Amino acid sequence: GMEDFVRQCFNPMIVELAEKAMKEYGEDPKIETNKFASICTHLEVCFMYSDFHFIDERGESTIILKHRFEIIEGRDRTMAWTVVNSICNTTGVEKPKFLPDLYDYKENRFIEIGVTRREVHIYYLEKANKIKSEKTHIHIFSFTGE
Amino acid sequence: MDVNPTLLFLKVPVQNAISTTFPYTGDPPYSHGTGTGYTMDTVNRTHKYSEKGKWTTNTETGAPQLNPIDGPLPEDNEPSGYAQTDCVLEAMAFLEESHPGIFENSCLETMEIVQQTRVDKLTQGRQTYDWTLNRNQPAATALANTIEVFRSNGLTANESGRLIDFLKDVMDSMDKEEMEITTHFQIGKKKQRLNKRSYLIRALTLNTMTKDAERGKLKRRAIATPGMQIRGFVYFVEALARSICEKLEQSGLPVGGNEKKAKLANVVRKMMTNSQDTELSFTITGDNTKWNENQNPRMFLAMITYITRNQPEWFRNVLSIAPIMFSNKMARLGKGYMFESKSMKLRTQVPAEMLANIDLKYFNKSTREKIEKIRPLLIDGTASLSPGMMMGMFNMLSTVLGVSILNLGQKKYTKTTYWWDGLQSSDDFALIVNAPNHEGIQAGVDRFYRTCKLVGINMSKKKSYINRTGTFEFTSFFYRYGFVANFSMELPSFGVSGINESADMSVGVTVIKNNMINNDLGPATAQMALQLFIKDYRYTYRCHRGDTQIQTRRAFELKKLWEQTRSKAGLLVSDGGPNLYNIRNLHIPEVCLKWELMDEDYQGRLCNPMNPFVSNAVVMPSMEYDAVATTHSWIPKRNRSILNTSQRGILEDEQMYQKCCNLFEKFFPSSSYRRPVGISSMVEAMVSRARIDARIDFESGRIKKEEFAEIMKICSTIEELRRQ
Amino acid sequence: MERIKELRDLMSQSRTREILTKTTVDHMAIIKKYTSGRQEKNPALRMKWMMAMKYPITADKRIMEMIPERNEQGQTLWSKTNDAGSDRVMVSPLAVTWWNRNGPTTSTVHYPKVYKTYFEKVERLKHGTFGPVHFRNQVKIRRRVDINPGHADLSAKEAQDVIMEVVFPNEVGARILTSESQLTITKEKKKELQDCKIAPLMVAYMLERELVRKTRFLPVAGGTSSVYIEVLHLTQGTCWEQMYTPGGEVRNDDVDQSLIIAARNIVRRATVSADPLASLLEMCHSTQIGGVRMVDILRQNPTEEQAVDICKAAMGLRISSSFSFGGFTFKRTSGSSVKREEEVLTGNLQTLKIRVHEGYEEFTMVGRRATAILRKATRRLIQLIVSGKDEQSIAEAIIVAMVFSQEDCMIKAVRGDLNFVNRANQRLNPMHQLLRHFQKDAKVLFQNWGIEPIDNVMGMIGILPDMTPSTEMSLRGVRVSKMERVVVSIDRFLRVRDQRGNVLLSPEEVSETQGTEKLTITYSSSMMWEINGPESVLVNTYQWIIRNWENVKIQWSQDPTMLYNKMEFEPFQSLVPKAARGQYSGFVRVLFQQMRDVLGTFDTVQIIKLLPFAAAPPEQSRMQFSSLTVNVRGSGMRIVVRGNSPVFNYNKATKRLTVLGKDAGALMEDPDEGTAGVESAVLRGFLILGKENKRYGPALSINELSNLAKGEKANVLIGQGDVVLVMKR
RNA sequence: AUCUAUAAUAGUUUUUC
RNA sequence: ACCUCUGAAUAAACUAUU
RNA sequence: AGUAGUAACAAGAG
Ligand SMILES: *O[C@H]1[C@@H](O)[C@H](n2cnc3c(N)ncnc32)O[C@@H]1COP(=O)(O)OP(=O)(O)OP(=O)(O)OC[C@H]1O[C@@H](n2c[n+](C)c3c(=O)[nH]c(N)nc32)[C@H](O)[C@@H]1O
Ligand SMILES: [Mg+2]
Ligand SMILES: [Mg+2]
């Protein structure tokens, strides 16, 4: 019954993006419902992170033009890697070994967003060991407000 | 004196003049009418080879199915399909015991292949039996129709792009109560709604036809075209069989050409060296009688089950689907027959779908007997064919079975003073038997024959012979202490291939060079072959020399081009120039061979990218046998027979497909070089690429803010149009 | 802007919008191959049929404005009829040949750049040098040769990734170039193709022609490099060889490989001569490698190899007593070895023979990124002291040292489907296979090697199986540290001694592998096959016996000693196993002597078959031989003393002698041939009288004939499944 | 020393009474 | 009857070329 | 009639 709640609560765009992301790797949203909810929450967090942000003519952060963040989540691996490669080539930023979630133009770095049901620190250490990069920024949320 | 060419073999050994025995200068035999007679003969013969088996009625299709597995052991030397399942499992077990880890490693490689293969693998091939039209279609067209039908029926797991997801969609379609399709007629579209059993019969159906242009056969034979539902499963099973065969020394597949000859020679010499000097050695030039009409899909399922032991369940299921579908297969009968009335001087086509309940007075005696024998099997316009592998399918799994039977011939298994080994390629084999005396040789041959009978393999006695080891024949390769040259096999390749002028010139010279390297084509004969090819090339393309008066429609233009040229040697043969090829420069493209002899303006016109015949730039249109594209790389016309049919909307559809594909290539330059991958739609991918590129161009200052805003506005308009 | 406007146009139309929305990128390939069906079955017949049509050729609709409808003679050049499934129009070949004489002319100056490979072929043929044509007994062998060399230190996939990086930087996906070769080539081609004005697809195809290796199996004689393969039709035939040298610049690695092959062949052949040094010198002065004299190459080639160094020392050149193994230059500071073949069982349950070096030895390892000192005994690593640069360099050095040590732990550490034969069932070098296997994944090797506590000597660090610098326990016998030619004298028997007097090299140290040359090796002497491969050596030896059968027969009848000492048999004797040369020679000489004393038992074929084995110094033993072994590509191929054999089969119907499947010539029947079925050159001390004779009990074996005495007739199972009556003189 | 790129096209091989 | 259209793509493995 | 050979062509479709 998780899928019914996921479709009822999350808005249709995020649901479609999560369904596409799961189908890309053969997963069925009807069967894998916990993963469905996880991906929907991850996409919702990333889109809340990105939206309502712009860059002025000077080049500093502003809140309401070009958006401050380039969204890499919610795309198939081909387009996501196209965006990552193009940004790295045009900006000189180091190319990550794994697909990040956002690119921040102001800080000129990649951001790896994480939403965790466990405590923040263990998941943060897991992601830090996984990527093996000191440049890819990591930002971890939690359902408990940590 | 009466001339007897055959007497040449009295002095020249037959293997050294084996080219004389291939009459490949005349036209090959063809099939003129229907293939229904041959298909019915094949079905009747396949069921006759298994007639003592158990009869059942399929609960899902209603088709009568004959099961010869574990049937009575034969008492004679007639062909039979009564393979014993325990014997096949024991052969697999001993093959695994002689090569530890072969099945495990093959399964690992095949698991990787299964997980990584994309759906567009199915487009590789000429024709696929389209169940939505009950006839053959181009593989890409059949796949597109199947995907469209599945999408209209809510079967969209193939959108991932993986082949295994397409197979999941096929399995899900098998459970749909009703499958809907679309039909055209004299040109409107009509919806047809199949039921569960009708769709199931269509999905298990293989098309049949006759084989045209086959050498060395007096009588014609039937061939099969697999449908869209089974192709992926057969591909995965054959991938596993290929992984197994690559690890087997006796396998004749999948190695071809000089590599195959070297492998076979090394294996034969290793067998000779391992043989003791104090024992006899005999080799059997062996064929099998009706290998594919006696092998059973149930035994292939058993082999796959033994091979995939201790594997994940999904892998076993995806490998097992193909034998299961093949043991429930139906065969299309074909075109039918034509009836001629002599008195009323009329002829008419009788469809094969009416043979179920047609009066038998029209047919002759033999056809009437065929129809009487096959009528119980007929269902829904097809024939139930449970036993047998139809035609040219599962060749490498057959090779695996044959190699297991060969492997059963080690002394640890024979447990006597004789032993055997040899080569296996699908159904053809060669066998080497060692024994202290002739009695042991006879005993070993008998044991091999009886073991093959046990696993359902019938050695063709009338097409096999045995002699002292040192000469044999295997897969049309003639071995006389080593493989001999056979020029007649490659003789039909010489000539104008029929691509275009440049490609045909390249093919001619490359064929001459390759036959010099491989088939012992001597230098003098190579020069004469070059002369003959040039003559045929000039006659075919109306491109004789400018300084000749051969009256053709093209002769005036070539005369004009010849007159105005200053350096005649620089002109291509396609333009009426001379032939500069000899033995030393057979490997060099013609345009490059005489590049420095060309006039500047003639060369500029010939290699002009702005010419209408080929789609600082260079001429580009798939440039096989065409190193440098010129105006001679044109494309001939397509067949226009489809304009008289109801499928003439496919032309407009493919025109729009090409338009969309070229527009997409305008956004992803590497798409033509390497095939793009992705689950997103074409418009979505193009819009995302346009947005990221516009942002980067603005950031690097290549475009100004106004153009960026215009691109963003057009992208927003496209997004709005996308939903509506 | 144009792209987005065209896309907006397509999204406005209903059908194109449906295609663009419902088709994913994966299905774009399917719709790209989508067609109504090109009914092409016999393209040759179809082309012959279409060339009789008025307009068999399609062209773009711009031809109606670029080419007139009719020429001067009024012949029509194009029609307004459209091709099926397209907007292209139907045109005549007259339109193409009209364009080639009246069309607009562009600048074709970039064509040699875009198609550099084909014009490179043209230049190589243009500046090539042709030598004489020699009619010989060619022996071609099916081997993997390269037809497109591509780049040396690249594979097809690595080359493709490099091409994608160079041409399509934003389409590379997730690939990151790791190999230093890839980074170097990528930078070089990016700089070279900077500000290039060619279409990116064409640039990618150029880089594919330049960088992508392609190898195929072909029946090849002579050099196997690309420059020789492309002219293989010209240079090699069934009965002739055309001397030819390509006109371009020759790669130096090919020169090194061919020099190694030639030096090994020359040294192995010279070892069996009476004076090895003089034979080696006269062979090195008569040898050419790719149109270049061998002596000049030796004077200007820094190649570390045993046979190459022996050849250098024979000519007074300074040598470096070194060799290569797994990308490192080894040098034996002290110790000695004797090779010995030992059969071992691999970790993945494979049985193979490995050349095991006995004795205790010490070495120094030098590599482009690491350096080590190695001490070892027979299949046992005493200690290894690596002083590499980074973690991966030290890991590679440790792996190479472990494989070199021939440790049984290393053998048992093999996992997976590691094959030790070629895809064409050609035996591979076991050490190379072990190196390539453990250089892919060496976790199991390090796990099974063991561990050992360190005593903290000089501060040299330890190493753990997961490549960490421990200070308490390390890999067994492995320690981690931190970061010249010599005048020699060569003996008459090719024994190289340093100035002090210690032995540095010897013929026994020369590898027994029989490889093939990248560049054609031309040898100019009486026997052009004297340093050829084993198959050519055997075929040409027996053909030499056949051609010279008259005087050879006379000498065999009168003065056998000089016949056995012919220089022509020495290339053959280089194939007989060293330990068995004397035994075979003595056995064959006794057979010949019995054949002379028993008149009428004169089998010509027997003498021809057994003569080359009598060229060695005889050793007298009572052992009987039913077959004599000859090393051909690593496998001992037997020649059966009685009856035909895989190496040697004589056909009585054709009177034609075939060796290894190659015709060697036709014999002529002698008047003194024995047309009585009596054989005297099959058993060392027994004369074959006739067929089976049941009077003398059961048949026995050849290896149990010592108990028999003078005149004791018996039945022996000599040969392939035959029993005959033999008697003792 | 190793050495199945990918793809397209053509060609070759693969029979009961 | 005029008129109009049209001249016909098995499977697998391999080889060659791009 | 002829081609041809286990079934066709000796024009087909609109
Ligand atoms: O392509 C072949 C050869 O030409 C090429 N090669 C050889 N040398 C060079 C150099 N110097 N530069 C570039 N290329 C070179 O490498 C290929 C060698 O193939 P193959 O002939 O089959 O191998 P080889 O017979 O040389 O044996 P290999 O395994 O490579 O070992 C080489 C060398 O090492 C000696 N060796 C091994 N072991 C374990 C030894 C030992 O324990 N003790 C001593 N004293 N020597 C040992 C081998 O016997 C050879 O001498
Ligand atoms: Mg992510
Ligand atoms: Mg056969």
Side-chain angles (χ1 to χ4, degrees), chain A residues 98-116:
Chain A
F98 307 94
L99 276 173
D101 307 319
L102 303 174
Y103 179 81
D104 185 10
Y105 288 105
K106 177 182 176 185
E107 262 61 36
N108 220 38
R109 60 181 179 182
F110 288 113
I111 306 178
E112 198 84 40
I113 300 291
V115 192
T116 312

Side-chain angles (χ1 to χ4, degrees), chain A residues 81-82 85-86 89 95 97, chain C residues 169-176:
Chain A
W81 278 116
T82 284
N85 292 325
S86 71
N89 290 338
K95 177 181 173 185
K97 307 180 182 182
Chain C
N170 302 332
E171 328 287 335
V172 296
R175 266 67 170 266
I176 47 181

